[PDB]
């Protein structure tokens, strides 16, 4: 089931992990360019959605406010999670927000092209990344409205 | 996670529900054109996959062997599950095969355009159709190669 409270197209938000409390950031310099962060609110943590239509109905591009790059999540090559210019040129720019099975208020950030979800954890490196496999709570996110 | 044993493109199979043991038929006359069935094997139970690429990577159109029509699954009008000619002209012709979280030998037939899964049950009417909501065992299917 698609998450029922997806931000209206163009509305700004942070993506905050339910369990760690960390937010995603997307910037253009200093690797890692997309990662999790546990600190003050900065503009590189702000995103909006481009709504997919046609073959991308129920998919969304995740665009960085300060730099205009959209997120990607791929299993092909490093960096596995990153950003790129455009409005969703590549199939791995398109995400589905899939509501959790037990927690109605959180969702997984799923990528159809790569069959992966994003996760945020405090344990093994890489502590932020994507993953193809079983459902874990560290895969659960909130939309934080600004 | 995508089912790891999706039949090669052009390989013929039936779609059998795990628990009911019923198969999907797709015929060209007499509503319902697509429904569940038990009894001897007939040609209109036979399907192949059209493999999606680019935006449709990891999706598939389910094409009837004898009549060439592809399945569709929608929520906008009756019939909800049906067939249409072509090779996946419309977005609701495209399905994802999502492995069960518990049973790695079965999968759900998921429709991205409508956010539905196909189900086969002996209990309440309608006994076959599509569904948006919790994961139940009556939503699990097998590829039965012929
Ligand atoms: C100051 C600094 O270099 N911080 C980086 C650090 O974060 C570690 C903290 N203990 C934390 O709370 O996470 O490592 C991470 C990668 O895990 C980042 O690179 C941090 O760089 C700060 O990131 C924010 C993101 O909102 C901004 O880009 C800041 O400009 C950047 O310094
Ligand atoms: C596009 C390409 O040739 N490959 C990668 C390259 O980017 C080169 C462009 N000319 C450019 O962006 O300047 O390096 C970047 C670094 O982040 C990417 O990995 C490119 O990979 C392409 O990335 C997209 C991201 O959405 C997809 O993974 C594509 O499949 C991949 O080819
Ligand atoms: C379980 C394990 O060996 N750890 C990590 C591993 O292996 C996973 C499979 N080989 C796979 O499908 O990739 O490598 C990946 C790197 O992508 C993960 O870090 C695995 O850790 C698992 O990650 C999930 C993320 O949601 C959870 O943190 C699990 O607790 C963790 O075991």
Tab-separated table of C-alpha atoms and ligand atoms in Angstrom:
chain	number	residue	atom	x	y	z
A	1	UNK	CA	0.000	0.000	0.000
A	2	UNK	CA	1.286	3.412	-1.015
A	3	UNK	CA	1.791	5.767	1.918
A	4	UNK	CA	-1.494	7.731	2.370
A	5	UNK	CA	-0.023	11.149	3.380
A	6	UNK	CA	2.509	11.959	0.655
A	7	UNK	CA	3.314	15.735	0.535
A	8	UNK	CA	1.568	17.701	-2.224
A	9	UNK	CA	3.873	18.225	-5.214
A	10	UNK	CA	6.288	21.089	-4.545
A	11	UNK	CA	5.817	21.159	-0.744
A	12	UNK	CA	9.095	21.229	1.194
A	13	UNK	CA	10.018	18.602	3.795
A	14	UNK	CA	12.752	16.697	5.555
A	15	UNK	CA	13.053	12.929	5.362
A	16	UNK	CA	13.549	11.713	8.938
A	17	UNK	CA	14.189	8.092	9.925
A	18	UNK	CA	11.707	6.848	12.505
A	19	UNK	CA	14.135	4.858	14.627
A	20	UNK	CA	17.487	6.731	14.540
A	21	UNK	CA	15.910	10.184	14.211
A	22	UNK	CA	18.462	11.024	11.495
A	23	UNK	CA	17.654	13.086	8.392
A	24	UNK	CA	18.855	12.653	4.807
A	25	UNK	CA	20.889	15.419	3.167
A	26	UNK	CA	21.789	15.946	-0.487
A	27	UNK	CA	24.688	18.306	-1.386
A	28	UNK	CA	27.041	18.869	-4.366
A	29	UNK	CA	30.437	18.827	-2.642
A	30	UNK	CA	32.291	16.749	0.003
A	31	UNK	CA	31.603	12.971	-0.118
A	32	UNK	CA	29.304	11.419	0.974
A	33	UNK	CA	27.012	13.724	-1.079
A	34	UNK	CA	23.858	11.898	0.081
A	35	UNK	CA	23.871	10.502	3.630
A	36	UNK	CA	22.181	10.664	7.008
A	37	UNK	CA	22.859	13.397	9.573
A	38	UNK	CA	22.198	13.958	13.294
A	39	UNK	CA	22.585	17.723	13.727
A	40	UNK	CA	21.060	21.181	13.133
A	41	UNK	CA	18.530	21.917	10.363
A	42	UNK	CA	20.349	22.873	7.150
A	43	UNK	CA	18.923	23.636	3.676
A	44	UNK	CA	20.607	20.587	2.095
A	45	UNK	CA	18.156	18.492	4.157
A	46	UNK	CA	15.181	20.013	2.335
A	47	UNK	CA	13.410	18.205	-0.473
A	48	UNK	CA	10.366	18.413	-2.685
A	49	UNK	CA	8.634	15.795	-4.833
A	50	UNK	CA	8.112	15.742	-8.557
A	51	UNK	CA	5.004	13.601	-9.103
A	52	UNK	CA	5.379	10.850	-11.666
A	53	UNK	CA	2.707	10.516	-14.360
A	54	UNK	CA	2.013	7.840	-17.007
A	55	UNK	CA	4.503	4.970	-16.564
A	56	UNK	CA	5.736	6.672	-13.353
A	57	UNK	CA	2.301	6.993	-11.726
A	58	UNK	CA	2.697	6.346	-7.992
A	59	UNK	CA	6.418	7.115	-8.312
A	60	UNK	CA	8.163	10.341	-7.280
A	61	UNK	CA	11.441	12.130	-7.905
A	62	UNK	CA	13.067	13.546	-4.762
A	63	UNK	CA	14.562	16.940	-5.593
A	64	UNK	CA	17.020	18.824	-3.356
A	65	UNK	CA	15.892	22.413	-2.604
A	66	UNK	CA	19.297	24.166	-2.531
A	67	UNK	CA	20.919	22.364	-5.489
A	68	UNK	CA	18.083	21.004	-7.673
A	69	UNK	CA	19.579	17.519	-7.966
A	70	UNK	CA	17.279	14.513	-7.649
A	71	UNK	CA	18.075	11.433	-5.571
A	72	UNK	CA	19.073	8.053	-6.968
A	73	UNK	CA	19.272	4.597	-5.402
A	74	UNK	CA	21.009	1.872	-7.416
A	75	UNK	CA	22.743	-1.482	-6.898
A	76	UNK	CA	24.935	-1.060	-9.990
A	77	UNK	CA	27.860	1.033	-8.674
A	78	UNK	CA	29.206	3.381	-5.990
A	79	UNK	CA	27.853	5.663	-4.771
A	80	UNK	CA	24.794	3.433	-4.427
A	81	UNK	CA	22.725	6.322	-3.085
A	82	UNK	CA	23.460	9.715	-4.572
A	83	UNK	CA	22.173	12.651	-6.555
A	84	UNK	CA	22.091	13.856	-10.153
A	85	UNK	CA	20.932	16.905	-12.138
A	86	UNK	CA	17.566	16.781	-13.902
A	87	UNK	CA	13.956	16.037	-13.055
A	88	UNK	CA	14.249	12.251	-13.068
A	89	UNK	CA	16.131	11.398	-16.270
A	90	UNK	CA	16.975	7.880	-15.098
A	91	UNK	CA	14.657	5.092	-14.006
A	92	UNK	CA	16.597	4.836	-10.702
A	93	UNK	CA	15.497	8.429	-9.914
A	94	UNK	CA	11.947	7.195	-9.196
A	95	UNK	CA	10.753	6.201	-5.781
A	96	UNK	CA	7.667	4.635	-4.294
A	97	UNK	CA	6.630	5.411	-0.721
A	98	UNK	CA	5.338	2.142	0.722
A	99	UNK	CA	3.493	2.324	3.984
A	100	UNK	CA	4.695	-0.026	6.711
A	101	UNK	CA	2.650	-3.134	7.485
A	102	UNK	CA	2.296	-2.380	11.218
A	103	UNK	CA	3.077	1.334	11.572
A	104	UNK	CA	0.546	3.386	9.541
A	105	UNK	CA	2.595	6.578	10.016
A	106	UNK	CA	5.870	5.532	8.420
A	107	UNK	CA	6.953	4.204	5.060
A	108	UNK	CA	9.800	2.723	3.096
A	109	UNK	CA	11.529	4.733	0.360
A	110	UNK	CA	11.488	2.105	-2.383
A	111	UNK	CA	13.197	2.220	-5.778
A	112	UNK	CA	11.535	0.177	-8.541
A	113	UNK	CA	14.544	0.154	-10.902
A	114	UNK	CA	16.980	-1.217	-8.298
A	115	UNK	CA	14.488	-3.098	-6.028
A	116	UNK	CA	15.958	-1.388	-2.946
A	117	UNK	CA	14.820	0.532	0.100
A	118	UNK	CA	16.747	3.262	1.963
A	119	UNK	CA	17.801	2.678	5.567
A	120	UNK	CA	19.218	4.614	8.510
A	121	UNK	CA	21.000	2.765	11.308
A	122	UNK	CA	23.634	3.264	14.023
A	123	UNK	CA	25.294	-0.166	13.703
A	124	UNK	CA	27.370	-1.499	10.801
A	125	UNK	CA	28.871	0.593	8.044
A	126	UNK	CA	27.547	1.738	5.755
A	127	UNK	CA	25.205	3.243	8.371
A	128	UNK	CA	23.165	4.878	5.595
A	129	UNK	CA	22.408	3.167	2.305
A	130	UNK	CA	20.085	1.059	0.244
A	131	UNK	CA	19.180	-2.608	0.643
A	132	UNK	CA	17.446	-5.448	-1.220
A	133	UNK	CA	16.029	-7.919	1.289
A	134	UNK	CA	13.811	-8.453	4.306
A	135	UNK	CA	11.845	-5.726	6.084
A	136	UNK	CA	13.597	-4.065	9.012
A	137	UNK	CA	12.431	-1.102	11.111
A	138	UNK	CA	15.591	0.825	10.231
A	139	UNK	CA	13.985	1.204	6.775
A	140	UNK	CA	11.116	3.333	8.086
A	141	UNK	CA	10.825	7.056	7.363
A	142	UNK	CA	8.701	10.096	8.174
A	143	UNK	CA	7.912	13.110	6.025
A	144	UNK	CA	8.850	16.098	8.198
A	145	UNK	CA	6.956	19.154	6.924
A	146	UNK	CA	8.617	22.565	7.094
B	1	UNK	CA	12.061	-8.099	-3.078
B	2	UNK	CA	11.291	-9.210	-6.638
B	3	UNK	CA	10.578	-12.936	-6.997
B	4	UNK	CA	13.946	-14.475	-7.999
B	5	UNK	CA	12.491	-17.087	-10.404
B	6	UNK	CA	10.427	-15.107	-12.921
B	7	UNK	CA	10.066	-17.171	-16.130
B	8	UNK	CA	12.183	-16.059	-19.086
B	9	UNK	CA	10.415	-13.906	-21.689
B	10	UNK	CA	8.257	-16.108	-23.954
B	11	UNK	CA	8.280	-19.140	-21.602
B	12	UNK	CA	4.711	-20.433	-21.099
B	13	UNK	CA	3.148	-20.985	-17.684
B	14	UNK	CA	-0.030	-21.054	-15.623
B	15	UNK	CA	-0.555	-18.785	-12.634
B	16	UNK	CA	-1.713	-20.972	-9.753
B	17	UNK	CA	-2.763	-19.635	-6.353
B	18	UNK	CA	-0.764	-21.255	-3.537
B	19	UNK	CA	-3.640	-21.899	-1.112
B	20	UNK	CA	-6.733	-22.424	-3.312
B	21	UNK	CA	-4.795	-24.238	-6.062
B	22	UNK	CA	-6.968	-22.339	-8.567
B	23	UNK	CA	-5.580	-20.935	-11.816
B	24	UNK	CA	-6.249	-17.701	-13.706
B	25	UNK	CA	-7.943	-17.979	-17.087
B	26	UNK	CA	-8.114	-15.201	-19.671
B	27	UNK	CA	-10.746	-15.656	-22.390
B	28	UNK	CA	-12.257	-13.365	-25.075
B	29	UNK	CA	-15.987	-14.010	-24.568
B	30	UNK	CA	-18.381	-14.412	-21.604
B	31	UNK	CA	-17.866	-12.190	-18.545
B	32	UNK	CA	-15.842	-12.545	-16.439
B	33	UNK	CA	-13.102	-12.691	-19.117
B	34	UNK	CA	-10.466	-13.076	-16.380
B	35	UNK	CA	-11.255	-15.178	-13.311
B	36	UNK	CA	-10.107	-18.106	-11.230
B	37	UNK	CA	-10.733	-21.715	-12.183
B	38	UNK	CA	-10.358	-25.304	-11.059
B	39	UNK	CA	-10.592	-28.282	-13.385
B	40	UNK	CA	-8.633	-29.676	-16.354
B	41	UNK	CA	-5.935	-27.541	-18.023
B	42	UNK	CA	-7.089	-25.491	-21.032
B	43	UNK	CA	-5.171	-23.162	-23.341
B	44	UNK	CA	-6.662	-19.918	-21.951
B	45	UNK	CA	-4.861	-20.595	-18.646
B	46	UNK	CA	-1.540	-20.204	-20.474
B	47	UNK	CA	0.501	-16.996	-20.302
B	48	UNK	CA	3.918	-15.573	-21.158
B	49	UNK	CA	5.666	-12.442	-19.868
B	50	UNK	CA	6.533	-9.326	-21.787
B	51	UNK	CA	9.624	-7.930	-20.029
B	52	UNK	CA	9.470	-4.213	-19.196
B	53	UNK	CA	12.509	-1.996	-19.824
B	54	UNK	CA	13.515	1.588	-18.983
B	55	UNK	CA	10.638	3.064	-16.951
B	56	UNK	CA	9.077	-0.420	-16.841
B	57	UNK	CA	12.199	-2.209	-15.546
B	58	UNK	CA	11.054	-4.876	-13.059
B	59	UNK	CA	7.498	-4.792	-14.401
B	60	UNK	CA	5.927	-7.306	-16.794
B	61	UNK	CA	2.899	-7.621	-18.995
B	62	UNK	CA	1.083	-10.961	-18.661
B	63	UNK	CA	0.124	-12.077	-22.177
B	64	UNK	CA	-2.342	-14.845	-23.049
B	65	UNK	CA	-0.845	-17.601	-25.231
B	66	UNK	CA	-3.988	-18.449	-27.234
B	67	UNK	CA	-5.461	-14.924	-27.597
B	68	UNK	CA	-2.551	-12.472	-27.133
B	69	UNK	CA	-4.396	-10.165	-24.738
B	70	UNK	CA	-2.636	-8.832	-21.646
B	71	UNK	CA	-4.060	-8.648	-18.130
B	72	UNK	CA	-4.996	-5.385	-16.499
B	73	UNK	CA	-5.773	-4.596	-12.887
B	74	UNK	CA	-7.525	-1.326	-11.975
B	75	UNK	CA	-9.788	0.313	-9.379
B	76	UNK	CA	-11.528	2.882	-11.596
B	77	UNK	CA	-14.301	0.772	-13.167
B	78	UNK	CA	-15.694	-2.740	-13.631
B	79	UNK	CA	-14.340	-5.205	-14.517
B	80	UNK	CA	-11.487	-4.518	-12.073
B	81	UNK	CA	-9.307	-7.315	-13.409
B	82	UNK	CA	-9.544	-7.973	-17.159
B	83	UNK	CA	-7.758	-8.274	-20.472
B	84	UNK	CA	-6.939	-5.965	-23.389
B	85	UNK	CA	-5.183	-6.490	-26.738
B	86	UNK	CA	-1.627	-5.287	-27.319
B	87	UNK	CA	1.672	-5.791	-25.544
B	88	UNK	CA	1.097	-3.565	-22.512
B	89	UNK	CA	-0.140	-0.317	-24.063
B	90	UNK	CA	-1.607	1.003	-20.786
B	91	UNK	CA	0.061	1.570	-17.412
B	92	UNK	CA	-2.325	-0.790	-15.564
B	93	UNK	CA	-1.095	-3.633	-17.792
B	94	UNK	CA	2.202	-3.772	-15.884
B	95	UNK	CA	2.845	-6.050	-12.949
B	96	UNK	CA	5.575	-6.563	-10.395
B	97	UNK	CA	6.216	-10.035	-8.932
B	98	UNK	CA	6.930	-9.412	-5.257
B	99	UNK	CA	8.262	-12.352	-3.227
B	100	UNK	CA	6.397	-13.080	0.008
B	101	UNK	CA	8.158	-11.946	3.185
B	102	UNK	CA	7.659	-15.379	4.785
B	103	UNK	CA	7.394	-17.924	1.959
B	104	UNK	CA	10.205	-17.446	-0.592
B	105	UNK	CA	8.455	-19.862	-3.005
B	106	UNK	CA	5.458	-17.608	-3.660
B	107	UNK	CA	4.831	-14.053	-4.797
B	108	UNK	CA	2.204	-11.400	-5.143
B	109	UNK	CA	1.015	-10.097	-8.491
B	110	UNK	CA	1.288	-6.377	-7.845
B	111	UNK	CA	0.044	-3.534	-10.056
B	112	UNK	CA	1.980	-0.267	-9.765
B	113	UNK	CA	-0.643	1.877	-11.562
B	114	UNK	CA	-3.489	0.791	-9.224
B	115	UNK	CA	-1.566	-0.224	-6.089
B	116	UNK	CA	-3.354	-3.599	-6.096
B	117	UNK	CA	-2.519	-7.304	-5.674
B	118	UNK	CA	-4.460	-10.231	-7.227
B	119	UNK	CA	-6.078	-12.727	-4.818
B	120	UNK	CA	-7.829	-16.093	-5.024
B	121	UNK	CA	-10.105	-17.255	-2.213
B	122	UNK	CA	-12.912	-19.742	-1.455
B	123	UNK	CA	-14.574	-17.500	1.120
B	124	UNK	CA	-16.399	-14.241	0.313
B	125	UNK	CA	-17.589	-12.914	-3.039
B	126	UNK	CA	-15.919	-11.690	-5.148
B	127	UNK	CA	-13.727	-14.778	-4.804
B	128	UNK	CA	-11.185	-13.497	-7.356
B	129	UNK	CA	-10.096	-9.898	-7.992
B	130	UNK	CA	-7.667	-7.215	-6.832
B	131	UNK	CA	-6.999	-5.658	-3.437
B	132	UNK	CA	-5.240	-2.760	-1.740
B	133	UNK	CA	-4.299	-3.491	1.858
B	134	UNK	CA	-2.800	-5.978	4.263
B	135	UNK	CA	-0.779	-8.967	3.082
B	136	UNK	CA	-2.890	-12.146	3.224
B	137	UNK	CA	-1.958	-15.662	2.120
B	138	UNK	CA	-4.745	-15.748	-0.498
B	139	UNK	CA	-2.653	-13.202	-2.431
B	140	UNK	CA	0.190	-15.671	-3.039
B	141	UNK	CA	0.807	-17.269	-6.456
B	142	UNK	CA	3.106	-19.672	-8.249
B	143	UNK	CA	4.511	-19.775	-11.749
B	144	UNK	CA	3.559	-23.238	-13.009
B	145	UNK	CA	5.778	-23.910	-16.039
B	146	UNK	CA	4.256	-26.083	-18.750
C	1	LIG	C1	30.935	19.165	10.720
C	1	LIG	C2	31.025	17.913	9.890
C	1	LIG	O1	31.941	17.754	9.092
C	1	LIG	N1	30.055	17.008	10.063
C	1	LIG	C3	29.932	15.830	9.207
C	1	LIG	C4	29.774	14.546	10.026
C	1	LIG	O2	28.599	14.384	10.849
C	1	LIG	C5	28.931	13.703	12.055
C	1	LIG	C6	28.051	14.193	13.212
C	1	LIG	N2	28.511	13.608	14.508
C	1	LIG	C7	26.567	13.883	12.949
C	1	LIG	O3	25.713	14.353	13.706
C	1	LIG	O4	26.165	13.173	12.011
C	1	LIG	O5	29.695	13.449	9.101
C	1	LIG	C8	28.541	13.476	8.241
C	1	LIG	C9	28.481	12.203	7.401
C	1	LIG	O6	27.978	11.154	8.240
C	1	LIG	C10	28.509	14.744	7.377
C	1	LIG	O7	29.477	14.727	6.308
C	1	LIG	C11	28.753	15.976	8.242
C	1	LIG	O8	28.991	17.077	7.363
C	1	LIG	C12	27.573	18.414	7.738
C	1	LIG	O9	26.472	17.823	7.051
C	1	LIG	C13	25.381	18.721	6.938
C	1	LIG	C14	24.168	18.013	6.322
C	1	LIG	O10	22.980	18.727	6.613
C	1	LIG	C15	25.841	19.945	6.138
C	1	LIG	O11	26.160	19.550	4.820
C	1	LIG	C16	27.079	20.592	6.786
C	1	LIG	O12	27.550	21.676	6.025
C	1	LIG	C17	28.183	19.557	6.929
C	1	LIG	O13	29.332	20.067	7.588
C	2	LIG	C1	25.802	9.243	-16.961
C	2	LIG	C2	27.069	8.422	-16.951
C	2	LIG	O1	27.745	8.313	-17.960
C	2	LIG	N1	27.429	7.777	-15.827
C	2	LIG	C3	27.731	8.290	-14.485
C	2	LIG	C4	28.573	9.569	-14.437
C	2	LIG	O2	27.985	10.855	-14.726
C	2	LIG	C5	28.513	11.413	-15.916
C	2	LIG	C6	27.635	12.577	-16.383
C	2	LIG	N2	28.185	13.186	-17.629
C	2	LIG	C7	27.504	13.596	-15.256
C	2	LIG	O3	26.622	13.482	-14.401
C	2	LIG	O4	28.286	14.543	-15.166
C	2	LIG	O5	28.918	9.788	-13.056
C	2	LIG	C8	27.814	10.080	-12.178
C	2	LIG	C9	28.346	10.340	-10.766
C	2	LIG	O6	27.292	10.258	-9.797
C	2	LIG	C10	26.734	8.981	-12.230
C	2	LIG	O7	27.072	7.876	-11.382
C	2	LIG	C11	26.458	8.474	-13.654
C	2	LIG	O8	25.731	7.237	-13.606
C	2	LIG	C12	24.515	7.288	-14.189
C	2	LIG	O9	23.894	7.684	-12.968
C	2	LIG	C13	22.484	7.671	-12.997
C	2	LIG	C14	21.980	8.276	-11.683
C	2	LIG	O10	20.575	8.341	-11.682
C	2	LIG	C15	22.022	6.234	-13.241
C	2	LIG	O11	22.505	5.403	-12.196
C	2	LIG	C16	22.566	5.773	-14.596
C	2	LIG	O12	22.205	4.440	-14.870
C	2	LIG	C17	24.081	5.895	-14.641
C	2	LIG	O13	24.528	5.645	-15.962
C	3	LIG	C1	22.991	-9.392	7.139
C	3	LIG	C2	24.332	-8.905	6.674
C	3	LIG	O1	25.214	-9.680	6.340
C	3	LIG	N1	24.513	-7.586	6.676
C	3	LIG	C3	24.496	-6.681	5.528
C	3	LIG	C4	24.719	-7.299	4.152
C	3	LIG	O2	24.214	-8.515	3.560
C	3	LIG	C5	22.926	-8.293	3.004
C	3	LIG	C6	22.686	-9.109	1.734
C	3	LIG	N2	23.957	-9.724	1.252
C	3	LIG	C7	22.106	-8.197	0.658
C	3	LIG	O3	20.988	-8.397	0.181
C	3	LIG	O4	22.751	-7.230	0.247
C	3	LIG	O5	25.092	-6.204	3.306
C	3	LIG	C8	24.127	-5.151	3.161
C	3	LIG	C9	24.830	-3.991	2.484
C	3	LIG	O6	23.864	-3.352	1.656
C	3	LIG	C10	23.452	-4.697	4.468
C	3	LIG	O7	24.237	-3.709	5.154
C	3	LIG	C11	23.199	-5.883	5.400
C	3	LIG	O8	22.716	-5.460	6.677
C	3	LIG	C12	21.357	-5.545	6.859
C	3	LIG	O9	20.910	-4.253	6.455
C	3	LIG	C13	19.557	-3.989	6.783
C	3	LIG	C14	19.157	-2.635	6.189
C	3	LIG	O10	17.771	-2.414	6.315
C	3	LIG	C15	19.392	-4.044	8.300
C	3	LIG	O11	20.150	-3.009	8.895
C	3	LIG	C16	19.854	-5.405	8.837
C	3	LIG	O12	19.819	-5.419	10.244
C	3	LIG	C17	21.271	-5.697	8.371
C	3	LIG	O13	21.616	-7.007	8.739
